[PDB]
């Protein structure tokens, strides 16, 4: 039951957010944000750079000073604030879902029922962790009393992508604020509006000034500024596998700040011959096409056992062909446009490459509309491991279907990737499910499902898909600094 | 590769163990311990009573005094001692296995390869916990520093059964000693020898006097004294569902001491139609006949799906008939005699009870030898839910095979019991395995296996099979007391 | 900033609560609840008995059935409900505070700023645990996959006291509901009104029918019925050290249900000679006089070092004499009346006994008003360890001040008690604080403060003050049942 | 009671360790290792380079292959191995202590009683952790079963210093091996002998070939090879703050492998006016001069309150002057020589610099022997924050004593450093201890003691002293990779 959207919601926030106040860039510059559905400019936004980053960091550091309102604050209170911010977001749910769609391209139905529900659940989950992440009392040798304090890491620089603007923001603020850190966030140039509106809600929630600071702008400028700043204690980057390397270098050459990376992937979705055909087909479609195929963990390599390959493909193609593309605000729209022209062209290039390599184009394969960045649901069959489309993250509505015979075979081929973010297995057999979930080198392995993220389930990657984690109790580790206090006592006893 | 046994091992310890010294009963009385294989008296053993238990408790309390060797000792050291004890037990492994068999009746091969291996693994596992059970530093509201100390509960009375003499001893000593407690243990009147020998190794390992005190004798006397003692902080009993009630009453009427009970059960072993036949039959046999069927968690209710019922039974009977019964010291022997005359008769009564109710006697059902307490592997088919052999713990080599149709049906029938210790499921289907493992109300649920116990896996029960646990990190909770220290600080900060 | 109270609030709920519906006792009987400030009857209340309890239990068991709304419900959702219930309580805060005071006697200011604040903080804290109490994946030996599930214990019978009607209710419902259990709660005959009103809020919050059932009545009838019921899985009693024995007996004689007891105590408050005199005096006054001295962890044994004894006592007496007694609804009132006549008389008896034993009466010692159950703030000096007033829980506004010399002395005298609920140390020396905090045998030990309870800090007792705990992560262990599932796998790897 | 040493122990291992076999460098190259006590060459050692590192890594990856002995091995068994290795090290305790002293310079008495004792305690502590690092079963939303597996990170590159040869190796192998990883370790060119001998014991203990591979050589060559290798999953460096930047750069530019750094520091030891003078003086001496002042966490900034400054300094000077320097093999020797000539001269330079800046030289200040690298115990008084000796890690027997007035002042000055490894506070006041332990920005804060390291207590650093940790439960997080498996189930229930 989705409330009717305002297909052209007004933009109330388009500036830099520091100390709970809106500022223009020092350079007084801005940049336009495009509506991927029309190609039209939604509005202008403050273009932050080094100087603005510096303004943000100092404000954060100041809010993190020993004795500040944020530091003395009871941990249970931080939880109270997170729950408050969630209630505000829920109040403005219909608006945010709309604004998210207007700037990202994704279906308003998805933004409301999915994106925003997950935002709410994420913030409410972490609110609960605020006063529940205990330190330890250690039974060290000798007459001593030793314990640990889990203190905040400090000023945390967070750079987030555009595929899930509001959600990525929540996944980062949630653990950081629950553990007492301060944030200097850089949002994507493609989708900065929703994040900024939330910063307004952060102020209304009652968070002390400087606790959360958002700086919209470009990656080479603002992003690198944060990653290089001498006063930033930790930087968390989430995006392309290429930019991540830049960040780890700029961070290790600046002040040895802690660095966590969340990169892309070429996640394998294995369908064994005994899988529920109807279920497998529908999930494999969802596995890839979800969010215009713009998912870090997208099932971009659909491995199918030979005995059921033909039937699977036939059904897959039918599902692709029936997938409705169009205005994200229309309730019947399943797939919206791609985020921007760059990606739009980048995808078309991959499709072209797929054709060049001998991959059998089964459906779609070109522009889906003369206005906006829409691409038809494309499906490539008889894909080989050596093909480009079977190795490089496409990040679009392009499905690759590979055929395999043995289970021993598919494990090797699935694991034969520089990536290892996620993977999935569709089978009715107990042994096969356990065999594969253990053999697959992936941060997350789904059985008879895909893209099932719980605010309580960790999300990390193996190999070059990343390091460290988001969501779950493990998420608190990365934003926590451990101090050991060892006191000399008169005489220790058990 | 099992060493050749000394079929008539010498008995070196047969008295009361207090302050690392051997004492006779104050009454000077003694009782005989019989060799279930021959019906002959192995030797005489000190018959402890309330006065002796008082001696043991006082000794234990002294050893637990603030500032005593055992209280000041580093936690890591306790681990060192546990490991030492394990090394000594392994040194004398061949002997203990023989002595275990002599007094219990179980096959020497099983005592050596199973019983003793599990004792070693148990003690070594717990040795490792000694310095790793941390307390917590709590982020309490206000300007305070709050933390917790995990102190020992104190003088722990432990009453152990005869089905697994050495192992039960290890399961109790392991967690209690690892956490710094002291023990006054009452061993079974039928199998007291091995436990007392181990007490000798306890002194050799270097444990302070009074840390572990063992008192052989009877339950109505020694057992009750421990459970009733005003200075015992906790009592852990393991045995019949009838005596457990006595203990919880004697404990709640004495000094409100903490009480954990490990009782029996009528565990269900469900065999789905798609299960691996060969595997399921062999394991279903083992699930019940193991240790002369003398298992708290024995699979006394073998439910089989109708489509495979006939075949299953036919194979089950064949396996039963081939089961070699005889001298426990002969390598070929699979089943030895029952522990004592009382049980011997108790089982014959149940067998007769089965015949009276209309349960189909498929094999065995009578005495297996004119000397000792040997009983033929017995199997009853077409058993119904209302039958007594289908509700009461027989504790003997008597198998009940029941027939069922749907999965919804078997869950209700399996859960329809006052017991809930264990359960098992044999299937190839993933959904069936998960459905069942979640629906079955049992402390432990095995999938495509049975009687799989790891030193690291907890063992507890639902309903009237018990409360609290043995093994695993959970085992330490029961032997730990939590103290909260809340200090007032100048000014709190994250 | 306390809102003006309604000194005679209307009573809307005065019946039994089963399946979110109000019932009359089967016996149609009722009983009066008195206003301790005037001795007047507030209203009649349904008097539940065994038959009513049976109705409640069957309702509870029904709601706990596999597949029910409460069982299938997402853990995070139970959190949502707890938070919702919190919000409702906050809405009607001012009313409940008044009703609390009306039926209990405690000052309205305290009910508003303290009692209800804690009720809210408690429920909100626990709501956060709902989806954060993980099970474990165990690295068991052999080719197996072993894991644990933390399942609800089931039907939880909870019996709560009258000293903190609303708060005790939160402390019990919080952990129970967050872990998915169902409740059959018996409230105090002296203070049943507020609990019954909250039950209305439990319905409004959206909790499935039968998840929480409250049965007002008497302890010998209703209480014993719960404790003895054959279908109650666990019973948690909080009250006098005498009734607790009855409950553990009735429970161990019924169905071996799990039992946790929260009993009284004679908590020692140690004031070292180097303590901040002003602070210590005010905190020691608070430590005992709080809530009309009706605290299980009251500092009823004030030990003072000799060098500062005289000065301390003088100041203590002055503070006592200035302590305002009167109508609980007046801002200037610090101490209201005692809960009922029984206690009122029981306290005067102890006061008379104190004088008989030679304890020096320093102030007060008799009735504070000719109407109600008011007693003057009494202080006894030069109290000796052997005196009755220095051994038995008075549960009233009577202070005992003892003199001591050495720190070794006070530890021995402090630990020389059958109780061990709480203790406190006032000093400026690091070593003295640590020495005492470790040597004192009490569940909680406050340093330079007293009665500091956080919803996150555990509250348990040693010796005969209880077993098990409330609040903190430890509170969840008592309401959780652990199931181990061990799956056979093809081949295990690290 | 220390056993008499062999002042010239035979060297049995001086090559590269790969697949439990000794190899020569591919380049057939070697390099000399000096005895810092005489300046004489002990023996020649294989000089490993990139090609050698490649042989090691390939060996490691092979040993880590799914299905390998090391991967299938029971976690409890890895524990067994670690304990076995410790038993072998204890057997050859006397030898290794001598060999450590021979190549390092530290007193044999300290090598035996401290270094080797800590090696044993570390290995045994970790052996215990092998089968106790559980994953989690997560209560995710929806009809799913979600859990985590803590898998090894893979091929671990470890680069260790020379200050504590054996201990540094233990601190690295312990947590890595316990968690199932494989190691390619690079030992210090100054102290490679003991580490290589221990590798011989690793073979004897029974570890699979390739589980631990040691490659002696130079940092620029071997070290950089490891940090840069495309197949190394993680690199852990411990050394100078200069080389650490190089490693994090070479790693983020290679394959985004995980990096943990353990750098130096200028740790503050704060002595309040109420501190136990005798104790504080002796401990402050130990804090800095220990292990020839070669400690990452050395108390190089001794802050003393003015009221006790003069007396403190006097006593400190007297202790320094009495500190015996000489042959590390003579029982009376408290301080041996510095590790090598480079360090020897670097320290003299710092001593010179101290004099140039106006630091008051109170004793020593020059070479302590014409043979070897012995330096006199040096003490500088009236040091200011701005001075070089007050900011840069000297890593030698040079103490800096600073004077302060307020507690608020010392906090700011203590925290005014790029480092944040350790800190200490000597006081008798509770509030002062808590205030300072919380306010000080250091990984470790000792109260009334220094250099107290338990195998169970974590050791990490703030700011530029490092990231990640060694020792304790936290040590396992860095060597663990978390996989989330989320299975679709029929119907979820609590």
Q: Where are the domains of chain A?
A: 2-264+455-494, 265-454
Long-range contacts of A18-24 (CB under 8 A, 24+ apart): A18/A52, A18/A55, A18/A56, A18/A59, A18/A210, A18/A213, A18/A215, A19/A59, A19/A63, A19/A209, A19/A210, A19/A213, A20/A202, A20/A203, A20/A207, A20/A209, A20/A210, A21/A209, A23/A52, A23/A55
Judge whether D123 and D86 are in contact, CB under 8 Å: yes
From C179, which residue of chain D is nearest by alpha-carbon distance?
D494
CA atoms within 13 A on the CB side of B488: 18
Candidates B233, B236, B231, B160; CA nearest to B198 is: B160
Q: What b-and-e string marks burial along C203-228, b requiring 16 or more CB atoms within 10 Å of the CB?
A: bebebbbbbbbbbbbebebbbbbbbb
Residue D459 pairs with which residues in a beta bridge? D470
Lookup: tokens for A305: 């056992």
**Residue C23 and residue C16 in contact, taking contact as beta carbons nearer than 8 Å:** yes
**Residue A52 and residue A215 in contact, taking contact as beta carbons nearer than 8 Å:** yes
Q: CA A427, A430, A436: angle at the middle one, nearest 5?
A: 65
A135 touches C: beta carbon within 8 Å: no
Name the residue in chain A with its Cα closest to that of C128: A128
- CA–CA separation, B234 vs C467, rounded Å? 11
- B contact chains, 3+ CB pairs < 8 A: A, C, D
- Residue pair A479/A152 in contact by the 8 Å Cβ criterion: yes
Among left, alpha and beta (phi > 0; psi -120 to 50; other), residue D410 is: alpha
Q: Measured between alpha carbons, how far is residue D452 from residues D444, D457, D459 in Å? A: 10, 9, 11
Q: Say whether A174 counts as a known binding-site residue.
A: no
Pair of tokens at residue A461: 């990657």
Whether D248 has its CB under 8 Å from any CB of chain A: the answer is: yes
Shortest CA distance to B243 belongs to which of B268, B226, B267, B230? B226
| Distance between CA atoms of residues A437 and C416, nearest Å | 58
Nearest C-alpha neighbor of D48 from the set D29, D71, D20: D29
On whether any CB of chain B is under 8 Å from the CB of D87, the answer is no
* Rounded distance between C-alpha atoms, residue C35 and residue B231, angstroms: 43
Nearest to B131 among A72, A139, A492 (CB): A139
Asked if B251 is an interface residue toward chain C (Cβ–Cβ < 8 A), one would say yes
Instruction: Scan for tokens 């008769």, then name that residue.
Output: B345
Q: CB-based contacts of C48: which residues, under 8 Å, 6+ apart?
A: C16, C25, C186, C215, C216, C217, C221, C222
3-state secondary structure of D281: helix
Contacts of C210 (CB under 8 A, 6+ apart): C18, C19, C20, C59, C60, C62, C63, C64, C70, C182
B349: how many CB neighbours lie within 10 A of its CB? 12
Q: Which letter, b or e, does each residue of B198-212 get, where b requires 16 or more Cβ atoms within 10 Å of its Cβ?
A: bbbbbbebebbbbbb
| CA atoms of B197 and B211, how far apart (whole Å) | 16
Q: Among all chains, which residue has been given the structure tokens 């707890």?
A: C82
**CA D151-D156-D158 angle, 5° bins:** 140
Cα dist from A459 to A468, B152, B259, D432, whole Å: 9, 39, 42, 42
| Cα–Cα–Cα angle for C27, C32, C38, rounded to 5 degrees | 180
B66 to chain A, any CB pair closer than 8 A? The answer is yes
Separation of alpha carbons C174 and C193, rounded Å: 19
Which chain B positions have a beta carbon within 8 Å of A136's beta carbon? 134-137
d(CA C296, CA C160): 13
Task: Report how far residue B445's alpha carbon sits from residue B425's, in angstroms, rounded to the nearest whole number.
Answer: 7
Question: B134 and A138 in contact by Cβ < 8 A?
Answer: yes
Q: How many CB atoms lie within 10 A of CB D146?
A: 25
- Please tell me the distance from the alpha carbon of residue C150 to that of residue D139, in angstroms, as a whole number: 10
Element (H, E) at D422: strand D422-426
HSE toward the beta carbon, residue A266, CA cutoff 13 A: 23
Sign for the pseudo-dihedral over CA of A408, A410, A416, A419: negative
Query: Touching check for A240 and chain D: CB below 8 Å?
Result: no
Alpha-carbon distance of A347 to A370, in angstroms, equals: 16
CA distance C398 to C392: 12
CA dihedral C318, C323, C325, C329 (to 10 degrees): 160
B434 contacts in D (CB within 8 Å)? Answer: 145, 487, 489-490
Residue B290's alpha-carbon distances to B102, B321, B399, D182, D468, in angstroms, are: 18, 15, 11, 40, 49
Q: How many CB atoms lie within 10 A of CB C372?
A: 24
Q: Experimental technique used?
A: X-ray
Contact A461, A420 (CB under 8 A): yes
D80 touches chain B (CB under 8 A): yes
Helix axes C306-322, C277-289, angle to 10 degrees: 60
CB distance B169 to B195 below 8 Å: yes
Residue A225 three-state SS: helix
Angstroms from C145 CA to nearest CA on chain D: 10
Separation of CA B241 from chain center: 13
Q: Which residues of chain A does D486 touch, with a Cβ-Cβ cutoff of 8 Å?
A: 444-447, 449, 452, 454, 457
Q: Which residue of C has its CA nearest to B472?
A: C138
CA C252 vs CA A336, B475, C432, C479: distances in Å? 65, 22, 43, 18
Which residues are bridge partners to C480 per DSSP?
C152
CB D484 to CB A445 under 8 A?
A: yes
Partner residue opposite A67 with nearest CB, options B134, B135, B491: B491
D438 to chain B: closest CA residue: B493
Of C142, C245, C458, the CB nearest to B482: C458
D296 catalytic? Reply is yes
Task: Quickly count: other Cβ atoms within 10 Å of residue B386's Cβ.
Answer: 8
Chain B contact probe: residue of C485, C489, C492 with most B CBs at under 10 A? C485
Q: Please, where are the H alpha helices in D300-429?
A: 306-322, 341-356, 407-414
Buried b (16+ CB within 10 A) or exposed e, B294-318: bbbbbbbbbbbbeebbeebbebbbe
Fold of A2-264+455-494: Aldehyde Dehydrogenase; Chain A, domain 1 (3.40.605)
The one catalytic residue among A47, A100, A189, A262 = A262
Q: Name the residue with tokens 């149940």.
A: B350
Q: Which residues of C touch B139 (CB under 8 A)?
A: 456
Hey, are the CB atoms on C75 and D430 less than 8 Å from each other? no
Contacts of D296 (CB under 8 A, 6+ apart): D163, D238, D262, D263, D264, D265, D421, D465
Give me the helix-helix angle, D165-178 and D193-205, nearest 10°.
30
Angle of CA points D463, D466, D470, to nearest 5°: 135
In the numeric block, which tokens belong to residue B224? 């009750």
Active site residue A296: yes
A241 annotated as a binding-site residue = yes
| C129–A132 C-beta distance less than 8 A | yes
Measured between alpha carbons, how far is A108 from A89 in angstroms, rounded to an integer?
16
Interchain CB distance below 8 Å, D75 and C491: no
CATH annotation of A265-454: 3.40.309.10
Specify whether the CB–CB gap between B276 and B405 falls below 8 A. no
In chain C, which residues have their Cβ closer than 8 Å to the Cβ of B445? Answer: 483-486
Distance CA(A389)–CA(A385), nearest Å, equals: 9
Burial zone of C4 (CB within 10 Å; 0-12 exposed, 13-18 middle, 19+ buried)? exposed
What is the Cα–Cα distance from B71 to B85, expressed in whole angstroms? Answer: 19
Q: Which two tokens stand for residue B372?
A: 């000792």
Residue whose structure tokens are 């059932």: C213
Q: Is the minimum CB–CB distance between A468 and chain B shorter than 8 Å?
A: no
Nearest 10 degrees: Cα torsion C376, C381, C386, C387: -30
From CA D176, how far away is CA D167, in angstroms rounded? 14
Compare all CA atoms of chain B with the CA of A64 and give the residue at the minimum distance.
B494
At CA A328, angle to CA A326 and CA A331, rounded to 5?
95
What phi and psi, each to the nearest 5 degrees, are found at residue B485?
-110, 125
Strands (DSSP E) along B53-188, which ranges?
135-138, 144-152, 155-159, 182-186
Is D144 touching C (CB cutoff 8 A)?
Answer: no
CB contact, 8 Å: C477 with chain B?
yes
What are the distances in angstroms from CA A308 to CA A315, A405, B400, C325, D289? 11, 10, 43, 85, 73
Residue C123 near residue C80 (C-beta atoms within 8 A): no
Report the alpha-carbon distance of residue C300 to residue A11 in Å, rounded.
64
- Taking contacts as CB-CB distances below 8 angstroms, the residues of chain C near B134 are none
Q: Decide if B493 and A66 are in contact by the 8 Å CB cutoff.
A: yes
What Å distances lie between residue D434 and A66, C154, D268, D407, CA to CA? 14, 43, 16, 12
Q: Are C141 and D74 in contact (CB under 8 A)?
A: yes
Query: Do A299 and A283 meet the contact criterion of CB atoms below 8 Å apart?
Result: no
Tell me whether residues A71 and B494 touch, CB distance under 8 A: yes
Q: How many CB atoms lie within 10 A of CB A28?
A: 8
Are D139 and C152 inside 8 Å of each other by CB?
Answer: no
Element (H, E) at C100: helix C93-104
D131 touches chain C (CB under 8 A): yes
- Going by their DSSP bridges, the two strands C234-238 and C258-262 should be labelled as parallel
Residues C18 and C55 sit within 8 Å (Cβ to Cβ): yes
Task: Measure CB to CB from residue A452 to each of D460, D472, D486 and give the nearest one.
Answer: D486
Chain C residue nearest residue D131, CA to CA: C139
- Do residues A267 and A445 touch, judged by C-beta distance below 8 A? no
D72 exposure class (CB count in 10 Å sphere: 0-12, 13-18, 19+): middle
């Amino acid at each position: 039951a989705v409330p009717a959207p305002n297909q052209q919601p007004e933009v109330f926030c388009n500036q830099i957010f520091i100390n709970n106040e809106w500022h223009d860039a020092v350079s007084r510059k801005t940049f336009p944000t495009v509506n991927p559905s029309t190609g039209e400019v939604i509005c202008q936004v403050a273009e932050g750079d080094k100087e603005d980053v510096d303004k943000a960091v100092k404000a954060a550091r100041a809010a993190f000073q020993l004795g500040s309102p944020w530091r003395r604050m009871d941990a249970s209170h931080r939880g109270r604030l997170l729950n408050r911010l969630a209630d505000l977001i829920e109040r403005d749910r219909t608006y945010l879902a709309a604004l998210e769609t207007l700037d990202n391209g994704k279906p308003y139905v998805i933004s409301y029922l999915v994106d925003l529900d997950m935002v709410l659940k994420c913030l409410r989950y972490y609110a609960g962790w605020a006063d529940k992440y205990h330190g330890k009392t250690i039974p060290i040798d000798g007459d001593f009393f030793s314990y640990t304090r889990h203190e905040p890491v400090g000023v945390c620089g967070q750079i987030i992508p555009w595929n899930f603007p509001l959600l990525m923001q929540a996944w980062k603020l949630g653990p950081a604020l629950a553990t007492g850190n301060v944030v200097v966030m850089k949002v994507a140039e493609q989708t900065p509006l929703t994040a900024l509106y939330v910063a307004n809600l952060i102020k209304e929630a009652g968070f002390p000034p400087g606790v959360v600071n958002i700086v919209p702008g470009f990656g080479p400028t603002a992003g690198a500024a944060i990653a290089s700043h001498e006063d930033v204690d930790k930087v968390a980057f989430t995006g392309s596998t290429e930019i991540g390397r830049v960040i780890q270098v700029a961070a290790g050459s600046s002040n040895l700040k802690r660095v966590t990376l969340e990169l892309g992937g070429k996640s394998p979705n294995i369908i064994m011959s005994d899988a529920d055909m109807d279920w497998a087909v529908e999930q494999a479609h969802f596995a890839l096409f979800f969010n215009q195929g713009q998912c870090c963990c997208a099932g971009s390599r659909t491995f199918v056992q030979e005995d059921i390959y033909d039937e699977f493909v036939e059904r897959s193609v039918a599902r692709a062909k029936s997938r409705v593309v169009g205005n994200p605000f229309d309730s019947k729209t399943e797939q919206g446009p791609q985020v921007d022209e760059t990606q739009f062209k980048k995808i078309l290039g991959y499709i072209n490459t797929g054709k060049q390599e001998g991959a059998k184009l089964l459906c779609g394969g070109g522009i889906a509309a003369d206005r906006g960045y829409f691409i038809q649901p494309t499906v490539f069959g008889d894909v080989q491991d050596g093909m480009t489309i079977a190795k490089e993250e496409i990040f679009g509505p392009v499905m690759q279907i590979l055929k395999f015979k043995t289970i021993e075979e598919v494990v090797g081929r699935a694991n034969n990737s520089t990536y290892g973010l996620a993977a999935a297995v569709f089978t009715k057999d107990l042994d096969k499910a356990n065999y594969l979930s253990q053999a697959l080198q992936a941060g997350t392995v789904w059985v008879n499902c895909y893209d099932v993220f719980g605010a309580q389930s960790p999300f990390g990657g193996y190999k070059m898909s990343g390091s460290g984690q988001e969501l779950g109790e493990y998420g608190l580790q990365a934003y926590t600094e451990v101090k050991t206090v060892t006191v000399k006592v008169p005489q220790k006893n058990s």
